[PDB]
Amino acid sequence: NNLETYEWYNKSISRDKAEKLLLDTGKEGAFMVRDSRTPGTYTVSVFTKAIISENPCIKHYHIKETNDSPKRYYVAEKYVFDSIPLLIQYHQYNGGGLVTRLRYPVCG
Amino acid sequence: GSPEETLVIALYDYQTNDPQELALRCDEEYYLLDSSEIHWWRVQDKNGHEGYAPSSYLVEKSP
């Protein structure tokens, strides 16, 4: 899938760089994605200035891969999406199962 | 003292955006029923308000 079109998608970035890069934003909601070696199971790097023990903190919500049809990617046990662009958008607004409903994307 | 279930609290003043989510009153507190989840930790308000509460804004009180 050509995710290079989106912003949250970033393969040229690693976890360490993902955790730091997001830190630069220093904004609550700052969310992004990081390609994974898997054949189809990227990762949603969610950064939200929260937590007391460790702040800031990065939430690595690894899209639950459900090799089914449909049933594929999802992160909330609520609803399942057959694509990442949906899970990323469905959370942009409305409401879902996310510590900090996505509302602020990041880019390189 | 944190035997089987720990307790968490909201750092800021997170507000519920949906019935599913659990409203928090910066200073409130509850218990932990599902810490296995990476997103929400099904907590139970003393009043009886059970809902998905934000793990981030939350943190195990611990001893």
From Swiss-Prot, chain A:
Disruption phenotype: Mice display decreased mature thymocytes and elicit profound defect in CD4+ and CD8+ T-cell development. Additionally, they show a strong decrease of cytokine production in response to TCR receptor stimulation. Impaired TCR-mediated calcium response in gamma-delta T-cells. Loss of Vgamma2-positive immature thymocyte-specific transcriptomic profile, although there is no change to overall transcription factor expression levels. Not required for the generation of IL17A expressing gamma-delta T-cells. Induction: Through a myriad of surface receptors including the TCR/CD3 signaling complex, coreceptors, or chemokine receptors. It comes from the Eukaryota. Ubiquitinated. It is found in: Cytoplasm; Nucleus. Coiled coil: none annotated. Is detected in the thymus, lymph node and very faintly in the spleen, but is not detected in the liver, lung, kidney, heart, brain, intestine or testis. Expressed in T-lymphocytes and mast cells. It may also be expressed in natural killer cells. Residues 8-106 form the SH2 domain. Belongs to the protein kinase superfamily. Tyr protein kinase family. TEC subfamily. The N-terminal PH domain allows ITK to be recruited to the plasma membrane by an activated PI3 kinase. This domain also contains a proline-rich region (PRR). The adjoining domain is a SH3 domain, which binds to PRR (from itself or from other proteins). Next, a SH2 domain is required for binding tyrosine-phosphorylated substrates. In the C-terminal region, the kinase domain is required for tyrosine phosphorylation. Homooligomerizes; this association negatively regulates kinase activity. Interacts with PPIA/CYPA; this interaction regulates TCR signal strength via a proline-directed conformational switch in ITK. Interacts with THEMIS. Interacts with FASLG. Interacts with VAV1; this interaction is important for VAV1 localization and TCR-induced actin polarization. Interacts with TBX21. Tyrosine kinase that plays an essential role in regulation of the adaptive immune response. Regulates the development, function and differentiation of conventional T-cells and nonconventional NKT-cells. When antigen presenting cells (APC) activate T-cell receptor (TCR), a series of phosphorylation lead to the recruitment of ITK to the cell membrane, in the vicinity of the stimulated TCR receptor, where it is phosphorylated by LCK. Phosphorylation leads to ITK autophosphorylation and full activation. This is Tyrosine-protein kinase ITK/TSK. It comes from Mus musculus. The gene is Itk. The chain holds residues 238 to 344 of 625 of the full protein.
